[PDB]
Amino acid sequence: SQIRQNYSTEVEAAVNRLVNLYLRASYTYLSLGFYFDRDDVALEGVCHFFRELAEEKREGAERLLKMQNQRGGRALFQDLQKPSQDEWGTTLDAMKAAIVLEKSLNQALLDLHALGSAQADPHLCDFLESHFLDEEVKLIKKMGDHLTNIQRLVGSQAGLGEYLFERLTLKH
Amino acid sequence: SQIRQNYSTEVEAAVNRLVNLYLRASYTYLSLGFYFDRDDVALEGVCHFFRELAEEKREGAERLLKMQNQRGGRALFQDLQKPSQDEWGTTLDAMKAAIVLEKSLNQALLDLHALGSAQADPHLCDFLESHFLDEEVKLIKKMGDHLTNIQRLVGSQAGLGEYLFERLTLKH
Amino acid sequence: SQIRQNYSTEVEAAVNRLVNLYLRASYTYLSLGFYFDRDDVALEGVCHFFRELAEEKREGAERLLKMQNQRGGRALFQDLQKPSQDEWGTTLDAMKAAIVLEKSLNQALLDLHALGSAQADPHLCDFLESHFLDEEVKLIKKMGDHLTNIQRLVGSQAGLGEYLFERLTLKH
Amino acid sequence: SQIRQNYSTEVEAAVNRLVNLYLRASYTYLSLGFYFDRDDVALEGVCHFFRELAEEKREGAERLLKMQNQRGGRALFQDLQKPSQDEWGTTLDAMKAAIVLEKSLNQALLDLHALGSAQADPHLCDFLESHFLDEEVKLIKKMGDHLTNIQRLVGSQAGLGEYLFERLTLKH
Ligand SMILES: [Pd+2]
Ligand SMILES: [Pd+2]
Ligand SMILES: [Pd+2]
Ligand SMILES: [Pd+2]
Ligand SMILES: [Pd+2]
Ligand SMILES: [Pd+2]
Ligand SMILES: [Pd+2]
Ligand SMILES: [Pd+2]
Ligand SMILES: [Pd+2]
Ligand SMILES: [Pd+2]
Ligand SMILES: [Pd+2]
Ligand SMILES: [Pd+2]
Ligand SMILES: [Pd+2]
Ligand SMILES: [Pd+2]
Ligand SMILES: [Pd+2]
Ligand SMILES: [Pd+2]
Ligand SMILES: [Pd+2]
Ligand SMILES: [Pd+2]
Ligand SMILES: [Pd+2]
Ligand SMILES: [Pd+2]
Ligand SMILES: [Pd+2]
Ligand SMILES: [Pd+2]
Ligand SMILES: [Pd+2]
Ligand SMILES: [Pd+2]
Ligand SMILES: [Pd+2]
Ligand SMILES: [Pd+2]
Ligand SMILES: [Pd+2]
Ligand SMILES: [Pd+2]
Ligand SMILES: [Pd+2]
Ligand SMILES: [Pd+2]
Ligand SMILES: [Pd+2]
Ligand SMILES: [Pd+2]
Ligand SMILES: [Pd+2]
Ligand SMILES: [Pd+2]
């Protein structure tokens, strides 16, 4: 009703879904974090790497909402799906689930930049690049590096490898 | 399987529900915060009072989970219901919805302390008192005080009252 | 004649017009500022909010010219139209005239980014995004917020509302 | 004979036994500490983690006695049973014996809070909660976490695992 200019309804709706994907990502990381803090799991380095993660993904969603408000859009919130798992297995399984997760957020950012361009919205561009696409590429680089390291501490000594990985790379 | 001692399954389950109630409260406050930041609402003092709120309720849920982990319990997460409203009306409506909200969290804390006592769990007691019941009583006091003030800037000059309330009590 | 590379004549000309639109905006804000400093208007908070404004819009035009020089373009200056009004009415009227003004600058920035893309000029992109489109979106957000507040101090007590708005939001 | 008020003889006696259980725990940890300092055992990280332990359990017993004096009770001391073992085996065996030990102290604290409530002694409550039950829950969490880690450095490489555990988690 007042400051909205060159901010289409389809972008608005896609921004709304992206906030939902970020908060769900936040929620996943929170679950991942408390899982590795369990007394029969107990890997503190892995718990805080995920905490953290949950914060980043939560700041992602906040940065989006505020942007949405800046353009005269309207935040609409939906239910947050619970994380896809209750137990997360080993640091390896967990780090796979995170990369799957960040890859899908990256894809959603790309699907939305492709919408920005097709909607003559050069400023969204721009906001997504300067603020999201970059972090996302670095992060996925960092997780891939971790995965490569866990995978090399592979076999036949799974317990020792996780212990050392968590002691020597994750802690903190 | 290891450190769990005098931590019943019913307490575990009730702790799980309480984390869910706290995160839903967090989510509500996030919605409330971005609502008052809209360009056709624009009350910054009210937006940050809610931000804040969302943090506190999120720290509440974290303090519970960590406790749950300390006792050898197991965090179980469920879907988070979206906030009960998409638009929150005036500062008055919003501050009513918050008190309704904090009252129901307080009741859930009480229902759980009544379970702690009936489950011979003197330590939960204790954790809930030293950490939750108190904040909750102060907070509800602070909101009631606000409500009494908004209600006195009542009629016939609604716009002026909200402006002054937000300038003189809420900002910041 | 020397460093110019991938800088079309149509972009040059549009950059020239945009500098003119920015300086005219500067001039408008200068008039707005001295108006509210008149002894029969006398609202100091509103005078310096506009001063300020005039500076920003003047830095906008300078940033454009220097860019134009960097690309080997040639600054061409035209007459500056006097502001559209000699008296600016109330803070409300004035804040409407400013938003109309900043909206039209934003549109001109967009018309020029659409030209940058259609002229295979990825660097202008880029310069406009990193430096102009963003400030413009924040600013229009800030003015819209003001307008919403003035409009809520609406009726029947116009004098009191402006006084309080200027005391409690604009000052300084 | 003077300040004693609402402090039953059965509580007095149970407090006396609890001091004895704490000092015996202190004594156990002292033995555990000097065992791992033996030249054919030689694990310094494990020796100081137990020293420490012995101090905490000794401060536990002191905090109880002083409380007992505050209420007008009378400290009665009994013989201290020697620790249940002369050699403590591996860090794993030792960390099992400690958890068994702290669990039984926790149970005794609970048996005594159940006595406090059944003796209309709201202040003991209270003293046990604010000062003992909590430390005990954290500590058992910390030991369980250790055990889970030792158990994962399990097989077939017992020597390496203890060395690394002691180097990377216990030291110091
Ligand atoms: Pd609007
Ligand atoms: Pd943790
Ligand atoms: Pd950490
Ligand atoms: Pd952690
Ligand atoms: Pd941490
Ligand atoms: Pd933006
Ligand atoms: Pd882009
Ligand atoms: Pd671009
Ligand atoms: Pd860290
Ligand atoms: Pd367990
Ligand atoms: Pd805000
Ligand atoms: Pd604030
Ligand atoms: Pd705010
Ligand atoms: Pd704020
Ligand atoms: Pd606890
Ligand atoms: Pd209690
Ligand atoms: Pd109590
Ligand atoms: Pd604040
Ligand atoms: Pd040249
Ligand atoms: Pd002035
Ligand atoms: Pd000023
Ligand atoms: Pd001024
Ligand atoms: Pd000034
Ligand atoms: Pd440039
Ligand atoms: Pd661009
Ligand atoms: Pd200023
Ligand atoms: Pd006495
Ligand atoms: Pd030693
Ligand atoms: Pd040590
Ligand atoms: Pd030592
Ligand atoms: Pd030492
Ligand atoms: Pd006492
Ligand atoms: Pd108690
Ligand atoms: Pd130490």
mmCIF file of N, CA, C and O in Angstrom, chain A residues 41-100:
data_model
loop_
_atom_site.group_PDB
_atom_site.id
_atom_site.type_symbol
_atom_site.label_atom_id
_atom_site.label_comp_id
_atom_site.label_asym_id
_atom_site.label_seq_id
_atom_site.Cartn_x
_atom_site.Cartn_y
_atom_site.Cartn_z
ATOM 1 N N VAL A 41 26.265 -40.492 22.657
ATOM 2 C CA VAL A 41 26.929 -40.077 21.448
ATOM 3 C C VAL A 41 28.143 -39.247 21.791
ATOM 4 O O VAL A 41 29.227 -39.608 21.375
ATOM 5 N N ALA A 42 27.951 -38.142 22.513
ATOM 6 C CA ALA A 42 29.058 -37.380 23.148
ATOM 7 C C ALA A 42 30.321 -36.983 22.276
ATOM 8 O O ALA A 42 31.435 -37.439 22.501
ATOM 9 N N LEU A 43 30.101 -36.075 21.344
ATOM 10 C CA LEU A 43 31.114 -35.574 20.451
ATOM 11 C C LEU A 43 30.957 -34.044 20.520
ATOM 12 O O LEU A 43 30.207 -33.480 19.666
ATOM 13 N N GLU A 44 31.606 -33.357 21.499
ATOM 14 C CA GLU A 44 31.274 -31.908 21.680
ATOM 15 C C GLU A 44 31.626 -31.031 20.485
ATOM 16 O O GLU A 44 30.802 -30.134 20.114
ATOM 17 N N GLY A 45 32.758 -31.301 19.832
ATOM 18 C CA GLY A 45 33.150 -30.541 18.660
ATOM 19 C C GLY A 45 32.054 -30.533 17.616
ATOM 20 O O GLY A 45 31.889 -29.547 16.923
ATOM 21 N N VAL A 46 31.284 -31.616 17.505
ATOM 22 C CA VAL A 46 30.299 -31.753 16.446
ATOM 23 C C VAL A 46 29.011 -31.017 16.837
ATOM 24 O O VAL A 46 28.436 -30.242 16.033
ATOM 25 N N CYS A 47 28.563 -31.239 18.066
ATOM 26 C CA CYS A 47 27.515 -30.372 18.668
ATOM 27 C C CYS A 47 27.699 -28.811 18.436
ATOM 28 O O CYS A 47 26.697 -28.136 18.123
ATOM 29 N N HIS A 48 28.912 -28.231 18.573
ATOM 30 C CA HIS A 48 28.962 -26.734 18.470
ATOM 31 C C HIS A 48 29.149 -26.211 17.050
ATOM 32 O O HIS A 48 28.932 -25.029 16.718
ATOM 33 N N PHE A 49 29.676 -27.081 16.219
ATOM 34 C CA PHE A 49 29.762 -26.802 14.810
ATOM 35 C C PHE A 49 28.288 -26.662 14.272
ATOM 36 O O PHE A 49 27.983 -25.781 13.469
ATOM 37 N N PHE A 50 27.387 -27.517 14.751
ATOM 38 C CA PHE A 50 25.982 -27.402 14.417
ATOM 39 C C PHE A 50 25.175 -26.290 15.090
ATOM 40 O O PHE A 50 24.156 -25.967 14.560
ATOM 41 N N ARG A 51 25.662 -25.646 16.158
ATOM 42 C CA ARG A 51 24.849 -24.699 16.916
ATOM 43 C C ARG A 51 24.466 -23.358 16.316
ATOM 44 O O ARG A 51 23.833 -22.575 16.984
ATOM 45 N N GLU A 52 24.843 -22.961 15.132
ATOM 46 C CA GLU A 52 26.062 -22.252 14.766
ATOM 47 C C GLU A 52 25.958 -21.901 13.269
ATOM 48 O O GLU A 52 25.608 -20.769 12.941
ATOM 49 N N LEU A 53 26.010 -22.860 12.338
ATOM 50 C CA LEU A 53 24.873 -23.472 11.637
ATOM 51 C C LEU A 53 23.401 -23.144 11.974
ATOM 52 O O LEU A 53 22.765 -22.482 11.199
ATOM 53 N N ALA A 54 22.861 -23.569 13.099
ATOM 54 C CA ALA A 54 21.505 -23.169 13.379
ATOM 55 C C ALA A 54 21.394 -21.614 13.440
ATOM 56 O O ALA A 54 20.461 -21.039 12.892
ATOM 57 N N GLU A 55 22.377 -20.961 14.044
ATOM 58 C CA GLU A 55 22.353 -19.498 14.080
ATOM 59 C C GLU A 55 22.413 -18.915 12.678
ATOM 60 O O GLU A 55 21.698 -17.994 12.372
ATOM 61 N N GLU A 56 23.279 -19.435 11.841
ATOM 62 C CA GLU A 56 23.526 -18.837 10.530
ATOM 63 C C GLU A 56 22.276 -18.934 9.701
ATOM 64 O O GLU A 56 21.860 -17.989 9.088
ATOM 65 N N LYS A 57 21.655 -20.098 9.747
ATOM 66 C CA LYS A 57 20.478 -20.327 8.981
ATOM 67 C C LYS A 57 19.347 -19.443 9.560
ATOM 68 O O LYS A 57 18.588 -18.832 8.810
ATOM 69 N N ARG A 58 19.243 -19.342 10.880
ATOM 70 C CA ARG A 58 18.307 -18.371 11.452
ATOM 71 C C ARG A 58 18.588 -16.874 11.034
ATOM 72 O O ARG A 58 17.648 -16.146 10.706
ATOM 73 N N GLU A 59 19.841 -16.420 11.001
ATOM 74 C CA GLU A 59 20.173 -15.073 10.439
ATOM 75 C C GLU A 59 19.871 -14.914 8.960
ATOM 76 O O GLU A 59 19.388 -13.844 8.532
ATOM 77 N N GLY A 60 20.069 -15.971 8.197
ATOM 78 C CA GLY A 60 19.596 -16.019 6.841
ATOM 79 C C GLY A 60 18.134 -15.706 6.753
ATOM 80 O O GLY A 60 17.753 -14.865 5.958
ATOM 81 N N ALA A 61 17.281 -16.353 7.562
ATOM 82 C CA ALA A 61 15.848 -16.137 7.444
ATOM 83 C C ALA A 61 15.460 -14.694 7.859
ATOM 84 O O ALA A 61 14.656 -14.047 7.152
ATOM 85 N N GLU A 62 16.023 -14.213 8.966
ATOM 86 C CA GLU A 62 15.885 -12.798 9.373
ATOM 87 C C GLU A 62 16.306 -11.760 8.319
ATOM 88 O O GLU A 62 15.547 -10.839 8.073
ATOM 89 N N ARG A 63 17.465 -11.943 7.660
ATOM 90 C CA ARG A 63 17.934 -11.065 6.605
ATOM 91 C C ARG A 63 16.922 -11.058 5.496
ATOM 92 O O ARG A 63 16.555 -9.995 5.031
ATOM 93 N N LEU A 64 16.419 -12.220 5.078
ATOM 94 C CA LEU A 64 15.309 -12.251 4.109
ATOM 95 C C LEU A 64 14.029 -11.495 4.539
ATOM 96 O O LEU A 64 13.453 -10.694 3.733
ATOM 97 N N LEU A 65 13.583 -11.677 5.793
ATOM 98 C CA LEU A 65 12.334 -11.060 6.177
ATOM 99 C C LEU A 65 12.464 -9.539 6.127
ATOM 100 O O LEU A 65 11.581 -8.845 5.682
ATOM 101 N N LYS A 66 13.578 -9.036 6.606
ATOM 102 C CA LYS A 66 13.813 -7.610 6.728
ATOM 103 C C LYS A 66 13.855 -7.032 5.309
ATOM 104 O O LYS A 66 13.246 -5.987 5.043
ATOM 105 N N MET A 67 14.527 -7.729 4.396
ATOM 106 C CA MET A 67 14.505 -7.354 3.025
ATOM 107 C C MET A 67 13.089 -7.272 2.468
ATOM 108 O O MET A 67 12.708 -6.293 1.834
ATOM 109 N N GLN A 68 12.331 -8.335 2.669
ATOM 110 C CA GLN A 68 10.955 -8.407 2.279
ATOM 111 C C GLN A 68 10.272 -7.133 2.817
ATOM 112 O O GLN A 68 9.564 -6.477 2.031
ATOM 113 N N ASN A 69 10.475 -6.770 4.112
ATOM 114 C CA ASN A 69 9.823 -5.562 4.684
ATOM 115 C C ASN A 69 10.307 -4.303 3.978
ATOM 116 O O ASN A 69 9.508 -3.431 3.645
ATOM 117 N N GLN A 70 11.604 -4.231 3.703
ATOM 118 C CA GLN A 70 12.158 -3.056 2.974
ATOM 119 C C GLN A 70 11.557 -2.713 1.626
ATOM 120 O O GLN A 70 11.438 -1.558 1.291
ATOM 121 N N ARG A 71 11.122 -3.731 0.900
ATOM 122 C CA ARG A 71 10.531 -3.625 -0.390
ATOM 123 C C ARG A 71 9.021 -3.452 -0.286
ATOM 124 O O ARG A 71 8.323 -3.418 -1.273
ATOM 125 N N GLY A 72 8.492 -3.393 0.919
ATOM 126 C CA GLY A 72 7.018 -3.277 1.034
ATOM 127 C C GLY A 72 6.282 -4.584 0.877
ATOM 128 O O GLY A 72 5.052 -4.582 0.738
ATOM 129 N N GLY A 73 7.018 -5.702 0.828
ATOM 130 C CA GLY A 73 6.402 -7.026 0.851
ATOM 131 C C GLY A 73 5.795 -7.381 2.232
ATOM 132 O O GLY A 73 5.902 -6.635 3.200
ATOM 133 N N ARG A 74 5.117 -8.511 2.298
ATOM 134 C CA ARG A 74 4.473 -8.944 3.496
ATOM 135 C C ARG A 74 4.877 -10.407 3.866
ATOM 136 O O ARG A 74 4.534 -11.374 3.124
ATOM 137 N N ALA A 75 5.624 -10.546 4.972
ATOM 138 C CA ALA A 75 6.008 -11.854 5.565
ATOM 139 C C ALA A 75 4.805 -12.719 5.818
ATOM 140 O O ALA A 75 3.846 -12.296 6.459
ATOM 141 N N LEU A 76 4.841 -13.934 5.307
ATOM 142 C CA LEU A 76 3.791 -14.885 5.630
ATOM 143 C C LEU A 76 4.471 -16.163 6.131
ATOM 144 O O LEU A 76 5.377 -16.680 5.505
ATOM 145 N N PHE A 77 4.059 -16.635 7.297
ATOM 146 C CA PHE A 77 4.720 -17.743 7.891
ATOM 147 C C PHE A 77 3.868 -19.022 7.765
ATOM 148 O O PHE A 77 2.600 -18.996 7.827
ATOM 149 N N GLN A 78 4.570 -20.133 7.627
ATOM 150 C CA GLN A 78 3.881 -21.453 7.534
ATOM 151 C C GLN A 78 4.447 -22.348 8.610
ATOM 152 O O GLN A 78 5.499 -22.007 9.195
ATOM 153 N N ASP A 79 3.813 -23.494 8.827
ATOM 154 C CA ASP A 79 4.313 -24.509 9.770
ATOM 155 C C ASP A 79 5.734 -24.891 9.455
ATOM 156 O O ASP A 79 6.120 -24.871 8.320
ATOM 157 N N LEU A 80 6.547 -25.237 10.449
ATOM 158 C CA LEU A 80 7.896 -25.771 10.160
ATOM 159 C C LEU A 80 7.889 -27.239 10.340
ATOM 160 O O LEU A 80 7.754 -27.695 11.448
ATOM 161 N N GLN A 81 8.045 -27.961 9.256
ATOM 162 C CA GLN A 81 8.335 -29.399 9.268
ATOM 163 C C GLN A 81 9.452 -29.769 10.217
ATOM 164 O O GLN A 81 10.490 -29.129 10.212
ATOM 165 N N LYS A 82 9.288 -30.810 11.010
ATOM 166 C CA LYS A 82 10.317 -31.319 11.922
ATOM 167 C C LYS A 82 11.469 -31.873 11.105
ATOM 168 O O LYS A 82 11.334 -32.078 9.880
ATOM 169 N N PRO A 83 12.657 -31.970 11.706
ATOM 170 C CA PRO A 83 13.813 -32.390 10.872
ATOM 171 C C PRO A 83 13.593 -33.745 10.280
ATOM 172 O O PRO A 83 12.732 -34.479 10.744
ATOM 173 N N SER A 84 14.305 -34.124 9.218
ATOM 174 C CA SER A 84 13.916 -35.396 8.584
ATOM 175 C C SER A 84 14.288 -36.677 9.395
ATOM 176 O O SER A 84 13.924 -37.771 9.044
ATOM 177 N N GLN A 85 15.037 -36.524 10.469
ATOM 178 C CA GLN A 85 15.482 -37.621 11.259
ATOM 179 C C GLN A 85 15.434 -37.312 12.740
ATOM 180 O O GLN A 85 15.503 -36.200 13.114
ATOM 181 N N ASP A 86 15.257 -38.346 13.557
ATOM 182 C CA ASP A 86 15.334 -38.241 15.008
ATOM 183 C C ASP A 86 16.741 -38.635 15.498
ATOM 184 O O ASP A 86 17.226 -38.057 16.495
ATOM 185 N N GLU A 87 17.357 -39.632 14.854
ATOM 186 C CA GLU A 87 18.796 -39.967 15.169
ATOM 187 C C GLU A 87 19.641 -39.719 13.941
ATOM 188 O O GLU A 87 19.214 -40.002 12.792
ATOM 189 N N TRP A 88 20.835 -39.232 14.143
ATOM 190 C CA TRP A 88 21.616 -38.797 12.983
ATOM 191 C C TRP A 88 22.823 -39.702 12.628
ATOM 192 O O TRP A 88 23.581 -39.349 11.754
ATOM 193 N N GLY A 89 23.017 -40.839 13.309
ATOM 194 C CA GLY A 89 24.102 -41.826 12.997
ATOM 195 C C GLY A 89 25.486 -41.239 13.304
ATOM 196 O O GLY A 89 25.679 -40.584 14.310
ATOM 197 N N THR A 90 26.428 -41.397 12.411
ATOM 198 C CA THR A 90 27.793 -40.976 12.704
ATOM 199 C C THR A 90 28.043 -39.583 12.175
ATOM 200 O O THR A 90 27.261 -39.031 11.426
ATOM 201 N N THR A 91 29.169 -39.003 12.529
ATOM 202 C CA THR A 91 29.539 -37.673 12.074
ATOM 203 C C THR A 91 29.464 -37.649 10.553
ATOM 204 O O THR A 91 28.966 -36.670 9.977
ATOM 205 N N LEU A 92 29.925 -38.737 9.917
ATOM 206 C CA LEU A 92 29.828 -38.908 8.481
ATOM 207 C C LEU A 92 28.358 -38.781 7.984
ATOM 208 O O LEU A 92 28.125 -38.080 7.027
ATOM 209 N N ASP A 93 27.404 -39.518 8.578
ATOM 210 C CA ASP A 93 26.040 -39.483 8.112
ATOM 211 C C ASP A 93 25.524 -38.072 8.255
ATOM 212 O O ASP A 93 24.930 -37.497 7.320
ATOM 213 N N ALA A 94 25.817 -37.495 9.401
ATOM 214 C CA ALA A 94 25.369 -36.200 9.724
ATOM 215 C C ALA A 94 25.893 -35.131 8.778
ATOM 216 O O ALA A 94 25.171 -34.169 8.435
ATOM 217 N N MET A 95 27.153 -35.240 8.383
ATOM 218 C CA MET A 95 27.779 -34.247 7.525
ATOM 219 C C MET A 95 27.246 -34.425 6.081
ATOM 220 O O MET A 95 27.118 -33.399 5.364
ATOM 221 N N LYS A 96 26.852 -35.658 5.694
ATOM 222 C CA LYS A 96 26.147 -35.888 4.411
ATOM 223 C C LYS A 96 24.796 -35.211 4.429
ATOM 224 O O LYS A 96 24.465 -34.466 3.510
ATOM 225 N N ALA A 97 24.008 -35.471 5.482
ATOM 226 C CA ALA A 97 22.683 -34.827 5.589
ATOM 227 C C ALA A 97 22.811 -33.302 5.531
ATOM 228 O O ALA A 97 22.012 -32.682 4.866
ATOM 229 N N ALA A 98 23.844 -32.706 6.138
ATOM 230 C CA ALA A 98 24.018 -31.217 6.046
ATOM 231 C C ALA A 98 24.286 -30.647 4.693
ATOM 232 O O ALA A 98 23.847 -29.541 4.370
ATOM 233 N N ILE A 99 25.087 -31.342 3.932
ATOM 234 C CA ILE A 99 25.453 -30.930 2.548
ATOM 235 C C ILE A 99 24.241 -31.079 1.632
ATOM 236 O O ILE A 99 23.973 -30.212 0.846
ATOM 237 N N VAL A 100 23.536 -32.201 1.703
ATOM 238 C CA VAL A 100 22.242 -32.350 1.019
ATOM 239 C C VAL A 100 21.381 -31.148 1.341
ATOM 240 O O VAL A 100 20.835 -30.516 0.397
#
